[PDB]
Structures are given as C-alpha cells and as structure tokens.
C-alpha cells in the first residue's frame, strides 16, 4: 500500500464512449 | 478482432434504450421498443375479439371497454364497423343503432341488432337467433381523444 | 337492365407526446453532452413512422381468408432445375387462382418468413434473381426477384414470434401473396395521408416540465369492395417421405 | 496471435452440427447450393442474435 | 352545437370515380 509499486496509485475511471439507439424501420409499401 | 484506443487503466461504456412510458395500448410501462417490436400504441383505430368461439345456446353478447381497457373510454360516432367470421359490415348510424344480417351455415338468414353508448363505450349486441357453432364475432372502433385529452401516450 | 351501388372511405388518427424536466436535462448536459429535447423529438419522429409501417402488415396478415398448402423439401436425386420449375409451376398456378377472383390485372409481390426465404433463396440463377449488394438485416427488407415477376420481402423471425405471441398467427413458414391493383377504380390495400404529422412545442410549466406533441391523421385500411380477394396465404412443410433436409444434412427421417 | 485464438476457442456457447458425406448418387451442385444455405442459416441466426 | 369543437361542421361528401361493367366474349370458333 505504498507509492513505490503499482498497488500504491489509485485509479481513475475514463468515458470512453456512449451507445444511442439503433434505428428503427420497416419496409412494406409495395403492398 | 477490432481495434480500440486504451489510454487510461479503466475505462466505461454506457448505452441509451427506448422505453414505453405508459401502459396504454399493448404495452405495459417499462417494455422496450427496437426494430422488431409490434404493437398497438398511438393508433387509435383498433379491434378487438368479443367471442373467441360462440357456443351454441348463447344468444346475446355485451362489449365494455372496461375488460379490454383499463378504464371507461370515448368512442368517436359513427366509426364502429363489427366482424363476423373475419366479413365486415356497414357502419353504425350517427344516432347509436346498427343493422346487420348474416347467413347460417344450414342456410337461415339471421339478423344481429346492436346498440351503443358512446359516453363510455359500451356495446350491446342481441342476435334474432343463435349462430352457430364455433363462430367468432370481433368488433372495430375508434378511440375519441378530444373527448378525453389524458390518455395520450408517452416515452 | 343494370343496377348501382356505392362505397365511402374515411381516415384515423394517431398522437404521441414525450415529457423532461429541466434539472434532468441539466444534469444529462453536464454529466454526458448529452441533449434531451432533440433525442426526443427524433425518438417520436421516427416511431410515429415505425408503428403506422408495422399496422399496414398487421391488418394485411388478420383480414385474409384464403389458404393453400406445399410441401417444398427437395427429393434425394431430383436436380434443382426439375424441383425449380415445379415450385414455379405452384406459384403461378396460385397467383392465376388470385387474378380469376379478382378479374383484373396488376403487379405481384410476396411476404415470406425466414425459412421460406432461404428456400428460395437456394434456387438457380435464372429462376431467382438476387438483389444487387444484398445485405442481411434484421429489419424487414427486400432480396430480390423470382421469375423476373415477384418482388419477395423477407420477415425474420423474432417479428414472427412477436405477431404470433399477440394472437395473429403467422408462422416462420408462413408466406403471403398479393397482387397490386393499377386500374383507377379498384385496389387491393388504400393508404394516403390526410393530414401529415404536426409538430407542437408547449414551453416551460410552473411545474418546470418541458413537452412536446405530435398529432396527425392518415388511412390505412383494406378496400370496401373485394379488398380481402386481393390477397392468399401459403404455408410450407418439410415432411415428404424420402425427402432431403437441408439443415441436417441427411433423409428426412428415413 | 495464438492467445487470441485459444480465447476465442474456449469462450463459445452457442453449438450446432451438420453432416458432409456426399450422398450416393449427386452431383456437386446440388451439395454445394445446401451446403451453402446451411451456412447463410447459421449467419442468420448469429446476425439475428446480435442484432446489428 | 357550436363550431368550436370537432362535431358540430357539417361534412361534405366527395365523388371518386366511376365504374362500368368489364366486357364480354370467349374464343371457340377454332373447332
């Protein structure tokens, strides 16, 4: 728990990126 | 594999989804709406099914949109059309009457008279004689909003 | 001597709202960049489109009453030529059956589940004509032209289930048919817009909520006069005896 | 690259399975058109599944 | 009933098309 190895640093998180909804259609007009 | 950058030790990803916010129509509050969804909502046409088979001693079926909706609804004058065997009829007069025949499987000639209330959406249908066996009798209306502006669906 | 009779056509309604309040929006703008009021003013302008698409189908598949059966699995020897010829031999067979109910002429088309897709799919070149730079979807989409005639739609199956989970029944083997009306007078399925979709705003409440609302009128609904004859449904089975299945790989059960 | 692919090995659910011996008396068209209808199920079905 | 809300104006009907019967005849003369 000390500064001299990698253990010692806390993290932080990082956004990275974001999902949107996906489209939405249909196709039926030729009836 | 698929190539991402990595600049930090953790990293998060987040996603969005579309959600019904009312339980109007097909949908209950919290379903999930995508590509493949179906379902009536927002549509103010519909139909229903009365009977699902008709036995052969009944004689009279009721319509009250309390057991299909939640709640007494409006219904618009002069919309409301009724199926027998998937066969469409006339439309209801503006004054809450409506007329319809129909022919037996034997060959009889059978009448079916209805009546309406259009306050709360309540249909009597009184058949002259007892249909046959296995039918089925769904009806169509449509549903008034400026009667009742708080039904309107959201998301 | 002759006699008259007439026929009227009237249009529906549809409505759609969405709701926000300001310190959600705050908080989605500072947290994420995020933008409440255009996601759902998209959200809604795209279902509105969505849901009317998907009625069209739905009262097409409920209001048809007429039935035929084929059996589609490929005999252990026969070439894809003789099997070929036959199906087209079925289907013209079916599509003449339509034009005499209904006495007029007119385009063609189908609506075929996922199975039955790939079944046609599995024809020659010169019987089925692929769409140029087809790509699968899981939306419903179209993949090409048989007999240089029939424009066939593919469902997948997730739709499927879901109609069939609502009470309209229509299998993954299912496959509906429908001829396309171009005289003035006559047509199968009648759709326009009456009044297009009208986009309102209602500013901040006392209650700090923010709203929209979209309202608009259109028709969809089938043809008073023979509008149901336009269309038949077909349902396939693999069930011949010395048959091939093609998703095992051997007889279909000896 | 080969711990890729050993994670890529042991890390799949979803099985399926099929036969490739010829049958007696086809040709190679016939084989070829089914087998590739097989595979374009099983793209489907993944495609279907992921739904992208 | 007044104008202001949707019932209460008159609906005015409108004329489409016209339809006449399909023409007659078949083809037996060969034999």
């Given at each position: ?31 | ?41 927002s549509q103010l046409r ?110 | ?26 908080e989605a703008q500072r ?220 007889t279909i059960d000896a």
């Amino acid at each position: 728990e000390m500064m001299s190895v990698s253990d010692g640093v806390m993290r932080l998180p990082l956004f990275l990126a974001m999902i949107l909804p996906v489209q939405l259609g249909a196709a039926t007009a030729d009836a | 594999c698929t190539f991402i950058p990595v600049t930090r030790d953790q990293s998060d990803i987040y996603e969005v989804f579309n959600v019904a916010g009312s339980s109007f129509g097909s949908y209950a509050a919290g379903d999930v709406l995508d590509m493949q969804s179906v379902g009536v909502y927002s549509q103010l046409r519909r139909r229903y099914v009365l009977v699902a088979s008709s036995d052969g001693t009944s004689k009279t079926a009721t319509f009250k949109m309390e057991d299909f909706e939640g709640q007494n609804v409006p219904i618009r004058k002069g919309r409301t059309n009724i199926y027998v065997n998937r066969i469409k009829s006339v439309v209801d007069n503006g004054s809450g009457s409506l007329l319809h025949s129909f022919t037996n499987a034997a060959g009889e000639q059978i009448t079916v008279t209805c009546s309406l209330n259009y306050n709360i959406g309540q249909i009597a249908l009184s058949f002259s004689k007892a249909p046959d066996k296995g039918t089925e009798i769904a009806i169509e209306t449509e549903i008034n909003i400026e009667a009742a502006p708080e039904l309107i669906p959201l998301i | 001597n002759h006699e008259m009779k007439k026929y009227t056509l009237f249009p529906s309604q549809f409505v759609i709202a969405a709701e926000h309040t300001v310190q959600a929006a705050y908080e989605a703008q500072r947290e994420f960049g995020l933008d409440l009021g255009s996601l759902q003013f998209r959200t809604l302008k795209e279902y509105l489109s969505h849901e009317q698409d998907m009625l069209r189908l739905r009262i097409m598949i409920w209001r048809t009453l007429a039935t035929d059966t084929f059996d589609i699995a490929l005999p252990v020897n026969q070439s894809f030529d003789v099997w070929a010829t036959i199906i087209r031999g079925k289907f013209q067979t079916v599509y003449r059956d339509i034009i005499e109910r209904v006495k007029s002429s007119g385009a063609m088309g189908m609506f075929a589940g996922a199975d039955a897709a790939s079944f046609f799919k599995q024809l020659p070149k010169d019987f089925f004509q692929p769409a140029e730079d087809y790509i699968q979807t899981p939306y419903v989409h179209y993949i090409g032209t048989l007999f240089g005639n029939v424009k066939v739609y593919e469902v997948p199956a997730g739709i499927c289930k879901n109609l069939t989970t609502e009470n309209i029944q229509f299998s993954s083997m299912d496959v509906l048919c429908y001829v396309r009306d171009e005289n003035p007078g006559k047509a199968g399925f009648v759709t326009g817009d009456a009044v297009p979709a009208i986009p309102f705003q209602h500013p901040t409440t006392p209650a700090l909520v923010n709203r929209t609302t979209l309202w608009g009128s259109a028709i969809n609904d089938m043809h008073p006069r023979n509008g149901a004859d336009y269309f038949t449904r077909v349902t396939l089975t693999m069930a011949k005896k010395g048959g091939l299945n093609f998703i095992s790989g051997d007889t279909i059960d000896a």
